[PDB]
Amino acid sequence: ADTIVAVELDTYPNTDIGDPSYPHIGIDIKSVRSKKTAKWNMQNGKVGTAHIIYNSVDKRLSAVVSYPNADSATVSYDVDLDNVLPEWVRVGLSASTGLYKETNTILSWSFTSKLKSNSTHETNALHFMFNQFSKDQKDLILQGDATTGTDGNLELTRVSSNGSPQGSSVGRALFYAPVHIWESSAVVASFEATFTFLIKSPDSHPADGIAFFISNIDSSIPSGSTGRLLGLFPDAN
Amino acid sequence: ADTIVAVELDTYPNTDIGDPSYPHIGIDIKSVRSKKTAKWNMQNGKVGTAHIIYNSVDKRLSAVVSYPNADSATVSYDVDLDNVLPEWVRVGLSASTGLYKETNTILSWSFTSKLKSNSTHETNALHFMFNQFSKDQKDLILQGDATTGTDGNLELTRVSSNGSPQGSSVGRALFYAPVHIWESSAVVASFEATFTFLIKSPDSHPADGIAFFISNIDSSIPSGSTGRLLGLFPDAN
Amino acid sequence: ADTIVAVELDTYPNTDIGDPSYPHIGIDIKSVRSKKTAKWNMQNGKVGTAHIIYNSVDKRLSAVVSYPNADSATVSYDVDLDNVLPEWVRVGLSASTGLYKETNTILSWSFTSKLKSNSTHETNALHFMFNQFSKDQKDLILQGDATTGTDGNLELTRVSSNGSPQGSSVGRALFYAPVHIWESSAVVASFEATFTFLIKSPDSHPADGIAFFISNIDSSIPSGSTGRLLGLFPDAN
Amino acid sequence: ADTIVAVELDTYPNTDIGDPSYPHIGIDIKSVRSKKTAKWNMQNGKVGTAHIIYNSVDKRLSAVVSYPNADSATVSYDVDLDNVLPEWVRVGLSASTGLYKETNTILSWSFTSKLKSNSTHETNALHFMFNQFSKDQKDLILQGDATTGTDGNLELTRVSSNGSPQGSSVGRALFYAPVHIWESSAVVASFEATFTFLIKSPDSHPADGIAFFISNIDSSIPSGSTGRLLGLFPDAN
Ligand SMILES: [Ca+2]
Ligand SMILES: [Ca+2]
Ligand SMILES: [Ca+2]
Ligand SMILES: [Ca+2]
Ligand SMILES: [Mn+2]
Ligand SMILES: [Mn+2]
Ligand SMILES: [Mn+2]
Ligand SMILES: [Mn+2]
């Protein structure tokens, strides 16, 4: 199976798989059962922003999410990612719906990774920033129901012609280039990601969420990963 | 055939195809016969640096090359690249040798492209920086004789075990991700590239040169493009 | 007197000093009488974005301005800025009103300057980005009526408690650090600036405009530079 | 007195003030008596590179130092800098010698600070990079014996005409612009710094070291802070 590290914006509480009884943000290391969560006061229909940061010296994966006019939510987990992920990875965004649903619209996505070696300073870096997504966004690998270009946005899950979100949907977008997160000569490795999202639902119970993830380069959507599995995991182990 | 825009660091004067009678830097638009050249005082065995810049407002492709302790050489050509290249391209480095030879070693390579739309500011960007190249540089598409990892460098053309450059060699490295240089909503598009190189030869007449190029995404080395054709063009038209 | 290079967003046509008979964007080199202008379809009450770019190889100062859902306006002028400005400068934003008035609100401002020498690659750079302005923005030198912190914005000219713009006002904001735009070893120098603005007026004839400018480090608002002089020039010569 | 946070590259072991019995890297919070140290295999006459990183979510100040062909040394300390430093600070480099001496040459210095608010994404940033220092580096506040321009470098402490380091010297360089490290709306604040240095001595016992520091904006060299006090502290408390 794939190897997944993710920060989840989980909109629907699945208490039998360890979710708290409210929408939450979480850090997922090879399991949908988060290693750490924090309460997230998700706002239906408002544009929010999530930030994810990590470096190989501190070995702490941290995330912060907020909305304008509102307090933030944050979560952190101590994990050496070089012991979890391979040296080369792909990065992406994933989202899903099940019998409960919501739009999983991405309005912007940015990412910066750095590998500093011991050669004279010696910086190696990758950076990308999307503030619009066109109909043929060639530097994105779209998987499942993910589409780009509708209103210049990235719609991770299926949305009908009228704008209504559909249930039983799963979609992901991965940056085309592989990303180097470890090197034998690296003295410090770091990454930061930011994305802005619009989660909207006609219902009082939206589902299922959006995640920023890092995976083996050949990662694909696991069979049956709609709903609670967020398009990331093949089961709830 | 491929569509090529390139800045050439041409070390060997081929006067019958329009080269001046000395090493030179040139701007190549769909032909090895440069649209513009400038004299280049190439130094055998020294590390040099080339810079390339362009934006869609000014529509002028410019380049500067220098060595420490030395004056620079520069060349510019007015060209609307949106009338030459497709909307999506790949960027790369190419080099060749023929009966005359030289090492075509790249020590660093950086690139930044930006597409600013008319939406609130609205920046879209790609940036990469290589200051080392490992044995398995997965974000580089290596073509021909190009290799990475020998002394942490990118060797565009073949070098023997002892370090001697080989003749009749051609190699290229392209960044893995496609690059977006035009968009219908873009109000300004720009790119800048920098690379550091070491051209060394045991001979008084090194050949053939190194080029930074932009091409259709599916670009490949043209058959018979060793020597004077710089791994970029199928003929000298 | 000060030495000023500016890109003006001129909202009021002063035909006796060479302005065209409509709102326009212009490039100003040591005079309020622009060396080059282009028609600007200014929209009262909408947030717009201006971009300014320049490099020492091409020696062309260019600007583009737009609004969402609208076409852009652009202007360019060939000028070697090293022949106009001193080696060290300050950069800023200026605005004014006269008997006619408007708000001159800045919502964001970013700037990047680079000096690349001939030493191994050798990059020198300054970058700043403001997306909010607090009450005590210590890295900004505020001049005249300029204030920060009202709604997290930079108000270049005076606005009343109720939000109405006031006439006969002039204000500027300069970044605190001096900026290096030339060096004897520089092989390429470049700068880019972006700002987002909101110009609103209760009147059918707003005045007078906003400009991005570059000046001697000790630049101050010239006496009597309200209205048509944009807080930049001491007279209309 | 000033408020100082610093990462010290301490070349001389002063055991009575808590230094370990070997050259070391340390994190200093309001005292020359480091809160945390690690052994540093300092190499006389070789160019080395230090990296410093911090963010307000993790609240961990970390540093790594290395030389080409050598292993790194690293140190980390959990500290909420918003509880130590004021909201606005200046950043700089400091160095000293006493009866024992060394050159404290800086070859490059870069710094990036970011304040991300909860407004739509909302990035605020400062970045500077020096790869050369000229004779009149106006964006640097030089203090004490610090000079720029000799071989394009920043010499923190006094060096004679012949190149010999002098004892009883203290010098600092601070970036001219104040830096904003906290804001009421900031959801994440971060900074990273890098500098390359050349510490050389004719003696088997070099002294005293170089530090990257953050201080109140009006920070000045404390009286009698030569030698073991690194130009940062007024005493050894
Ligand atoms: Ca759930
Ligand atoms: Ca040739
Ligand atoms: Ca006017
Ligand atoms: Ca000591
Ligand atoms: Mn969950
Ligand atoms: Mn040629
Ligand atoms: Mn005008
Ligand atoms: Mn110590």
Side-chain angles (χ1 to χ4, degrees), chain D residues 4-8 10 12 14 16-20 24-37 96 208 211 222 225-237:
Chain D
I4 298 296
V5 163
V7 173
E8 57 167 57
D10 191 340
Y12 192 101
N14 306 103
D16 61 346
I17 61 160
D19 276 358
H24 53 284
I25 59 168
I27 287 159
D28 296 349
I29 308 296
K30 300 197 287 181
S31 172
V32 78
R33 298 186 186 239
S34 313
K35 304 306 182 181
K36 194 82 163 289
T37 59
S96 63
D208 275 88
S225 65
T226 42
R228 71 178 61 199
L229 300 183
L230 298 166
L232 300 176
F233 298 100
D235 53 52
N237 291 169

mmCIF file of all heavy atoms in Angstrom, chain D residues 4-8 10 12 14 16-20 24-37 96 208 211 222 225-237:
data_model
loop_
_atom_site.group_PDB
_atom_site.id
_atom_site.type_symbol
_atom_site.label_atom_id
_atom_site.label_comp_id
_atom_site.label_asym_id
_atom_site.label_seq_id
_atom_site.Cartn_x
_atom_site.Cartn_y
_atom_site.Cartn_z
ATOM 1 N N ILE D 4 18.619 40.277 24.664
ATOM 2 C CA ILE D 4 19.308 39.515 23.622
ATOM 3 C C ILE D 4 18.928 38.043 23.544
ATOM 4 O O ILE D 4 18.875 37.348 24.550
ATOM 5 C CB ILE D 4 20.845 39.576 23.858
ATOM 6 C CG1 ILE D 4 21.373 41.008 23.785
ATOM 7 C CG2 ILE D 4 21.573 38.644 22.887
ATOM 8 C CD1 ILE D 4 21.213 41.670 22.431
ATOM 9 N N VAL D 5 18.659 37.583 22.327
ATOM 10 C CA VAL D 5 18.500 36.164 22.039
ATOM 11 C C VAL D 5 19.574 35.917 20.995
ATOM 12 O O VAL D 5 19.706 36.695 20.054
ATOM 13 C CB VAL D 5 17.111 35.851 21.479
ATOM 14 C CG1 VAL D 5 17.083 34.490 20.810
ATOM 15 C CG2 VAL D 5 16.086 35.899 22.595
ATOM 16 N N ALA D 6 20.394 34.888 21.193
ATOM 17 C CA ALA D 6 21.478 34.628 20.259
ATOM 18 C C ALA D 6 21.836 33.164 20.099
ATOM 19 O O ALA D 6 21.597 32.341 20.983
ATOM 20 C CB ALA D 6 22.742 35.408 20.671
ATOM 21 N N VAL D 7 22.393 32.860 18.935
ATOM 22 C CA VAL D 7 23.014 31.578 18.684
ATOM 23 C C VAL D 7 24.502 31.881 18.597
ATOM 24 O O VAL D 7 24.944 32.635 17.733
ATOM 25 C CB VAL D 7 22.531 30.966 17.378
ATOM 26 C CG1 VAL D 7 23.347 29.704 17.057
ATOM 27 C CG2 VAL D 7 21.061 30.631 17.499
ATOM 28 N N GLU D 8 25.269 31.317 19.514
ATOM 29 C CA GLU D 8 26.694 31.592 19.554
ATOM 30 C C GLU D 8 27.532 30.472 18.958
ATOM 31 O O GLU D 8 27.250 29.286 19.167
ATOM 32 C CB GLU D 8 27.147 31.854 21.005
ATOM 33 C CG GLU D 8 26.848 30.723 21.993
ATOM 34 C CD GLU D 8 27.583 30.861 23.327
ATOM 35 O OE1 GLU D 8 27.426 31.899 24.000
ATOM 36 O OE2 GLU D 8 28.319 29.924 23.723
ATOM 37 N N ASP D 10 30.908 29.635 19.716
ATOM 38 C CA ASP D 10 31.862 29.979 20.765
ATOM 39 C C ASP D 10 33.150 29.209 20.585
ATOM 40 O O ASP D 10 33.179 27.992 20.746
ATOM 41 C CB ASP D 10 31.213 29.679 22.120
ATOM 42 C CG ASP D 10 31.993 30.245 23.294
ATOM 43 O OD1 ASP D 10 33.210 30.531 23.142
ATOM 44 O OD2 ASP D 10 31.442 30.427 24.411
ATOM 45 N N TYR D 12 36.140 29.731 22.257
ATOM 46 C CA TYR D 12 37.033 29.617 23.410
ATOM 47 C C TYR D 12 36.288 29.196 24.666
ATOM 48 O O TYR D 12 35.391 29.891 25.115
ATOM 49 C CB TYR D 12 37.730 30.953 23.667
ATOM 50 C CG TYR D 12 38.868 30.815 24.648
ATOM 51 C CD1 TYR D 12 40.181 30.750 24.209
ATOM 52 C CD2 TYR D 12 38.623 30.734 26.013
ATOM 53 C CE1 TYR D 12 41.229 30.614 25.111
ATOM 54 C CE2 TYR D 12 39.666 30.584 26.921
ATOM 55 C CZ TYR D 12 40.961 30.522 26.460
ATOM 56 O OH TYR D 12 41.994 30.382 27.358
ATOM 57 N N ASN D 14 35.281 29.100 28.207
ATOM 58 C CA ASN D 14 35.388 29.792 29.490
ATOM 59 C C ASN D 14 34.610 28.951 30.506
ATOM 60 O O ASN D 14 33.415 29.158 30.704
ATOM 61 C CB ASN D 14 34.812 31.204 29.400
ATOM 62 C CG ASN D 14 35.436 32.018 28.279
ATOM 63 O OD1 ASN D 14 34.833 32.211 27.210
ATOM 64 N ND2 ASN D 14 36.642 32.514 28.518
ATOM 65 N N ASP D 16 34.458 28.769 33.729
ATOM 66 C CA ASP D 16 33.852 29.358 34.921
ATOM 67 C C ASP D 16 32.529 30.072 34.659
ATOM 68 O O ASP D 16 31.818 30.424 35.595
ATOM 69 C CB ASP D 16 34.823 30.247 35.708
ATOM 70 C CG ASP D 16 35.325 31.425 34.915
ATOM 71 O OD1 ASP D 16 35.152 31.452 33.677
ATOM 72 O OD2 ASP D 16 35.934 32.370 35.462
ATOM 73 N N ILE D 17 32.186 30.281 33.392
ATOM 74 C CA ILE D 17 30.866 30.823 33.097
ATOM 75 C C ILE D 17 29.993 29.771 32.413
ATOM 76 O O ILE D 17 29.075 30.100 31.672
ATOM 77 C CB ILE D 17 30.905 32.148 32.298
ATOM 78 C CG1 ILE D 17 31.572 31.956 30.937
ATOM 79 C CG2 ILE D 17 31.570 33.249 33.119
ATOM 80 C CD1 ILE D 17 31.229 33.045 29.936
ATOM 81 N N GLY D 18 30.292 28.505 32.674
ATOM 82 C CA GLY D 18 29.450 27.427 32.173
ATOM 83 C C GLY D 18 29.766 26.856 30.811
ATOM 84 O O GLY D 18 29.120 25.899 30.392
ATOM 85 N N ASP D 19 30.751 27.412 30.109
ATOM 86 C CA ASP D 19 31.096 26.852 28.810
ATOM 87 C C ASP D 19 31.619 25.439 29.027
ATOM 88 O O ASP D 19 32.318 25.176 30.010
ATOM 89 C CB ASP D 19 32.273 27.599 28.181
ATOM 90 C CG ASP D 19 31.880 28.865 27.440
ATOM 91 O OD1 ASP D 19 30.676 29.212 27.336
ATOM 92 O OD2 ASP D 19 32.766 29.569 26.909
ATOM 93 N N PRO D 20 31.343 24.538 28.091
ATOM 94 C CA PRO D 20 31.976 23.215 28.111
ATOM 95 C C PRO D 20 33.455 23.399 27.776
ATOM 96 O O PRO D 20 33.833 24.481 27.327
ATOM 97 C CB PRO D 20 31.259 22.468 26.991
ATOM 98 C CG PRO D 20 30.791 23.549 26.066
ATOM 99 C CD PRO D 20 30.415 24.707 26.959
ATOM 100 N N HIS D 24 32.107 25.252 21.061
ATOM 101 C CA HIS D 24 30.735 24.765 21.079
ATOM 102 C C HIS D 24 29.778 25.738 20.427
ATOM 103 O O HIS D 24 30.101 26.899 20.238
ATOM 104 C CB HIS D 24 30.310 24.555 22.536
ATOM 105 C CG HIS D 24 30.521 25.764 23.400
ATOM 106 N ND1 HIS D 24 31.764 26.141 23.869
ATOM 107 C CD2 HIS D 24 29.647 26.693 23.856
ATOM 108 C CE1 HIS D 24 31.640 27.248 24.588
ATOM 109 N NE2 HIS D 24 30.366 27.608 24.591
ATOM 110 N N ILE D 25 28.610 25.233 20.045
ATOM 111 C CA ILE D 25 27.535 26.107 19.607
ATOM 112 C C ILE D 25 26.518 26.151 20.739
ATOM 113 O O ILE D 25 26.326 25.168 21.464
ATOM 114 C CB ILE D 25 26.924 25.648 18.274
ATOM 115 C CG1 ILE D 25 26.364 24.230 18.357
ATOM 116 C CG2 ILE D 25 27.960 25.751 17.190
ATOM 117 C CD1 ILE D 25 25.509 23.893 17.163
ATOM 118 N N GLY D 26 25.886 27.299 20.912
ATOM 119 C CA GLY D 26 24.956 27.448 22.008
ATOM 120 C C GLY D 26 23.799 28.371 21.734
ATOM 121 O O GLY D 26 23.834 29.199 20.816
ATOM 122 N N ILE D 27 22.744 28.198 22.512
ATOM 123 C CA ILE D 27 21.590 29.084 22.421
ATOM 124 C C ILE D 27 21.560 29.935 23.669
ATOM 125 O O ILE D 27 21.546 29.412 24.787
ATOM 126 C CB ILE D 27 20.295 28.289 22.257
ATOM 127 C CG1 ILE D 27 20.232 27.701 20.845
ATOM 128 C CG2 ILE D 27 19.079 29.187 22.496
ATOM 129 C CD1 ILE D 27 19.303 26.546 20.720
ATOM 130 N N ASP D 28 21.567 31.252 23.474
ATOM 131 C CA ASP D 28 21.653 32.206 24.571
ATOM 132 C C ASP D 28 20.372 33.003 24.691
ATOM 133 O O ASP D 28 20.002 33.724 23.758
ATOM 134 C CB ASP D 28 22.801 33.195 24.337
ATOM 135 C CG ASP D 28 24.165 32.533 24.318
ATOM 136 O OD1 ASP D 28 24.278 31.346 24.692
ATOM 137 O OD2 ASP D 28 25.196 33.140 23.934
ATOM 138 N N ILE D 29 19.712 32.886 25.841
ATOM 139 C CA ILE D 29 18.489 33.638 26.100
ATOM 140 C C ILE D 29 18.732 34.602 27.262
ATOM 141 O O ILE D 29 18.661 34.205 28.425
ATOM 142 C CB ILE D 29 17.307 32.686 26.443
ATOM 143 C CG1 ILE D 29 17.162 31.591 25.380
ATOM 144 C CG2 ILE D 29 16.023 33.469 26.604
ATOM 145 C CD1 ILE D 29 16.811 32.105 24.002
ATOM 146 N N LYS D 30 19.040 35.854 26.937
ATOM 147 C CA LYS D 30 19.248 36.909 27.944
ATOM 148 C C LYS D 30 20.447 36.697 28.871
ATOM 149 O O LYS D 30 20.566 37.355 29.914
ATOM 150 C CB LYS D 30 17.964 37.154 28.741
ATOM 151 C CG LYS D 30 16.807 37.587 27.853
ATOM 152 C CD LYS D 30 15.666 38.215 28.650
ATOM 153 C CE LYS D 30 14.885 37.181 29.432
ATOM 154 N NZ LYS D 30 13.757 37.829 30.179
ATOM 155 N N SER D 31 21.337 35.790 28.484
ATOM 156 C CA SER D 31 22.531 35.488 29.265
ATOM 157 C C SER D 31 23.588 34.830 28.405
ATOM 158 O O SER D 31 23.274 34.033 27.519
ATOM 159 C CB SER D 31 22.201 34.546 30.429
ATOM 160 O OG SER D 31 23.386 34.111 31.082
ATOM 161 N N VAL D 32 24.843 35.157 28.680
ATOM 162 C CA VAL D 32 25.964 34.525 27.996
ATOM 163 C C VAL D 32 26.084 33.058 28.435
ATOM 164 O O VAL D 32 26.726 32.251 27.767
ATOM 165 C CB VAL D 32 27.281 35.290 28.248
ATOM 166 C CG1 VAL D 32 27.847 34.972 29.637
ATOM 167 C CG2 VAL D 32 28.302 34.972 27.155
ATOM 168 N N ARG D 33 25.452 32.708 29.556
ATOM 169 C CA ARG D 33 25.474 31.327 30.018
ATOM 170 C C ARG D 33 24.399 30.577 29.249
ATOM 171 O O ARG D 33 23.231 30.590 29.633
ATOM 172 C CB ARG D 33 25.245 31.252 31.530
ATOM 173 C CG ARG D 33 26.325 31.958 32.336
ATOM 174 C CD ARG D 33 26.205 31.778 33.847
ATOM 175 N NE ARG D 33 27.184 32.590 34.567
ATOM 176 C CZ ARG D 33 28.095 32.093 35.396
ATOM 177 N NH1 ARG D 33 28.150 30.786 35.612
ATOM 178 N NH2 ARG D 33 28.949 32.899 36.008
ATOM 179 N N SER D 34 24.797 29.937 28.157
ATOM 180 C CA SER D 34 23.846 29.263 27.272
ATOM 181 C C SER D 34 22.864 28.341 27.974
ATOM 182 O O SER D 34 23.206 27.655 28.936
ATOM 183 C CB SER D 34 24.585 28.463 26.200
ATOM 184 O OG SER D 34 25.612 29.235 25.601
ATOM 185 N N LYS D 35 21.632 28.334 27.478
ATOM 186 C CA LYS D 35 20.612 27.442 28.006
ATOM 187 C C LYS D 35 20.842 26.032 27.487
ATOM 188 O O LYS D 35 20.382 25.061 28.085
ATOM 189 C CB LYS D 35 19.216 27.909 27.585
ATOM 190 C CG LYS D 35 18.893 29.347 27.974
ATOM 191 C CD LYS D 35 19.099 29.587 29.464
ATOM 192 C CE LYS D 35 18.716 31.010 29.844
ATOM 193 N NZ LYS D 35 18.915 31.286 31.292
ATOM 194 N N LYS D 36 21.548 25.934 26.364
ATOM 195 C CA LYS D 36 21.842 24.654 25.727
ATOM 196 C C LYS D 36 23.081 24.802 24.845
ATOM 197 O O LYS D 36 23.250 25.824 24.178
ATOM 198 C CB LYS D 36 20.649 24.216 24.873
ATOM 199 C CG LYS D 36 20.657 22.769 24.419
ATOM 200 C CD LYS D 36 20.140 21.829 25.501
ATOM 201 C CE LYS D 36 19.755 20.475 24.918
ATOM 202 N NZ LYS D 36 18.505 20.535 24.090
ATOM 203 N N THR D 37 23.947 23.793 24.861
ATOM 204 C CA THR D 37 25.134 23.759 24.005
ATOM 205 C C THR D 37 25.311 22.394 23.346
ATOM 206 O O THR D 37 24.695 21.394 23.737
ATOM 207 C CB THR D 37 26.416 24.060 24.801
ATOM 208 O OG1 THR D 37 26.564 23.089 25.845
ATOM 209 C CG2 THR D 37 26.304 25.371 25.550
ATOM 210 N N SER D 96 33.752 38.946 18.785
ATOM 211 C CA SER D 96 34.701 39.584 19.678
ATOM 212 C C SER D 96 35.999 38.802 19.762
ATOM 213 O O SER D 96 36.082 37.649 19.334
ATOM 214 C CB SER D 96 34.107 39.669 21.076
ATOM 215 O OG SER D 96 33.891 38.367 21.586
ATOM 216 N N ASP D 208 37.063 35.060 20.160
ATOM 217 C CA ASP D 208 36.169 34.423 21.130
ATOM 218 C C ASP D 208 34.931 33.796 20.512
ATOM 219 O O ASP D 208 34.305 32.928 21.121
ATOM 220 C CB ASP D 208 35.734 35.434 22.187
ATOM 221 C CG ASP D 208 36.731 35.546 23.298
ATOM 222 O OD1 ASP D 208 37.697 36.333 23.246
ATOM 223 O OD2 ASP D 208 36.585 34.791 24.286
ATOM 224 N N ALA D 211 28.272 35.395 16.832
ATOM 225 C CA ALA D 211 26.899 35.054 17.156
ATOM 226 C C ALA D 211 25.934 35.730 16.211
ATOM 227 O O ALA D 211 26.199 36.825 15.727
ATOM 228 C CB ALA D 211 26.566 35.452 18.591
ATOM 229 N N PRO D 222 27.370 46.485 24.594
ATOM 230 C CA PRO D 222 27.559 46.785 26.014
ATOM 231 C C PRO D 222 29.018 47.131 26.323
ATOM 232 O O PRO D 222 29.946 46.557 25.746
ATOM 233 C CB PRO D 222 27.165 45.483 26.709
ATOM 234 C CG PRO D 222 26.325 44.751 25.702
ATOM 235 C CD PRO D 222 26.939 45.093 24.377
ATOM 236 N N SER D 225 32.248 44.452 26.728
ATOM 237 C CA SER D 225 31.776 43.175 26.193
ATOM 238 C C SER D 225 32.728 42.518 25.188
ATOM 239 O O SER D 225 32.308 41.700 24.360
ATOM 240 C CB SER D 225 30.351 43.311 25.620
ATOM 241 O OG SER D 225 30.339 44.179 24.499
ATOM 242 N N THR D 226 34.006 42.874 25.253
ATOM 243 C CA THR D 226 35.018 42.182 24.471
ATOM 244 C C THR D 226 35.124 40.745 24.980
ATOM 245 O O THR D 226 34.468 40.359 25.955
ATOM 246 C CB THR D 226 36.395 42.844 24.639
ATOM 247 O OG1 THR D 226 36.596 43.194 26.027
ATOM 248 C CG2 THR D 226 36.456 44.173 23.891
ATOM 249 N N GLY D 227 35.964 39.963 24.323
ATOM 250 C CA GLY D 227 36.251 38.611 24.765
ATOM 251 C C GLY D 227 35.068 37.688 24.966
ATOM 252 O O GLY D 227 34.254 37.501 24.066
ATOM 253 N N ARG D 228 34.979 37.110 26.161
ATOM 254 C CA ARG D 228 33.972 36.088 26.433
ATOM 255 C C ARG D 228 32.514 36.539 26.335
ATOM 256 O O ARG D 228 31.624 35.703 26.251
ATOM 257 C CB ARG D 228 34.219 35.446 27.805
ATOM 258 C CG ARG D 228 33.900 36.384 28.963
ATOM 259 C CD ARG D 228 34.089 35.771 30.330
ATOM 260 N NE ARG D 228 35.476 35.366 30.541
ATOM 261 C CZ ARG D 228 35.859 34.499 31.466
ATOM 262 N NH1 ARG D 228 34.956 33.939 32.271
ATOM 263 N NH2 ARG D 228 37.136 34.191 31.581
ATOM 264 N N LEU D 229 32.270 37.847 26.370
ATOM 265 C CA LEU D 229 30.906 38.362 26.352
ATOM 266 C C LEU D 229 30.356 38.567 24.936
ATOM 267 O O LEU D 229 29.207 38.978 24.767
ATOM 268 C CB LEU D 229 30.816 39.642 27.186
ATOM 269 C CG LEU D 229 31.213 39.394 28.635
ATOM 270 C CD1 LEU D 229 31.037 40.668 29.444
ATOM 271 C CD2 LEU D 229 30.380 38.235 29.219
ATOM 272 N N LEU D 230 31.198 38.296 23.936
ATOM 273 C CA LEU D 230 30.775 38.225 22.522
ATOM 274 C C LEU D 230 30.116 39.471 21.932
ATOM 275 O O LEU D 230 29.442 39.386 20.900
ATOM 276 C CB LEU D 230 29.870 37.003 22.318
ATOM 277 C CG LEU D 230 30.551 35.667 22.620
ATOM 278 C CD1 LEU D 230 29.524 34.555 22.726
ATOM 279 C CD2 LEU D 230 31.569 35.333 21.537
ATOM 280 N N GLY D 231 30.309 40.614 22.583
ATOM 281 C CA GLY D 231 29.732 41.877 22.138
ATOM 282 C C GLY D 231 28.240 41.966 22.394
ATOM 283 O O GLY D 231 27.578 42.878 21.890
ATOM 284 N N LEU D 232 27.723 41.031 23.192
ATOM 285 C CA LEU D 232 26.285 40.913 23.416
ATOM 286 C C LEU D 232 25.788 41.209 24.820
ATOM 287 O O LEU D 232 24.664 41.669 24.994
ATOM 288 C CB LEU D 232 25.836 39.493 23.089
ATOM 289 C CG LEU D 232 26.054 38.979 21.668
ATOM 290 C CD1 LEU D 232 25.637 37.512 21.599
ATOM 291 C CD2 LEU D 232 25.248 39.818 20.714
ATOM 292 N N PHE D 233 26.602 40.898 25.821
ATOM 293 C CA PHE D 233 26.164 40.990 27.205
ATOM 294 C C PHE D 233 27.078 41.883 28.019
ATOM 295 O O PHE D 233 28.271 41.976 27.741
ATOM 296 C CB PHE D 233 26.083 39.583 27.802
ATOM 297 C CG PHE D 233 25.097 38.706 27.099
ATOM 298 C CD1 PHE D 233 25.513 37.773 26.169
ATOM 299 C CD2 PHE D 233 23.738 38.867 27.329
ATOM 300 C CE1 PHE D 233 24.591 36.981 25.507
ATOM 301 C CE2 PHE D 233 22.813 38.085 26.671
ATOM 302 C CZ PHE D 233 23.241 37.143 25.757
ATOM 303 N N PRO D 234 26.504 42.566 29.007
ATOM 304 C CA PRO D 234 27.268 43.497 29.849
ATOM 305 C C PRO D 234 28.023 42.793 30.977
ATOM 306 O O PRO D 234 28.927 43.384 31.584
ATOM 307 C CB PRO D 234 26.184 44.403 30.423
ATOM 308 C CG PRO D 234 24.956 43.533 30.492
ATOM 309 C CD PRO D 234 25.072 42.524 29.359
ATOM 310 N N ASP D 235 27.648 41.549 31.252
ATOM 311 C CA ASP D 235 28.316 40.755 32.275
ATOM 312 C C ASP D 235 28.053 39.284 32.012
ATOM 313 O O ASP D 235 27.400 38.932 31.027
ATOM 314 C CB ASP D 235 27.833 41.143 33.669
ATOM 315 C CG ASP D 235 26.340 41.098 33.781
ATOM 316 O OD1 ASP D 235 25.747 40.057 33.417
ATOM 317 O OD2 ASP D 235 25.669 42.060 34.197
ATOM 318 N N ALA D 236 28.546 38.433 32.907
ATOM 319 C CA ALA D 236 28.443 36.989 32.751
ATOM 320 C C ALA D 236 27.341 36.353 33.591
ATOM 321 O O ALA D 236 27.358 35.150 33.832
ATOM 322 C CB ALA D 236 29.795 36.341 33.069
ATOM 323 N N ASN D 237 26.373 37.152 34.020
ATOM 324 C CA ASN D 237 25.274 36.619 34.818
ATOM 325 C C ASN D 237 24.400 35.668 34.008
ATOM 326 O O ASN D 237 24.232 35.851 32.798
ATOM 327 C CB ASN D 237 24.424 37.752 35.394
ATOM 328 C CG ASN D 237 25.159 38.552 36.455
ATOM 329 O OD1 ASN D 237 24.698 39.615 36.869
ATOM 330 N ND2 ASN D 237 26.300 38.044 36.899
#
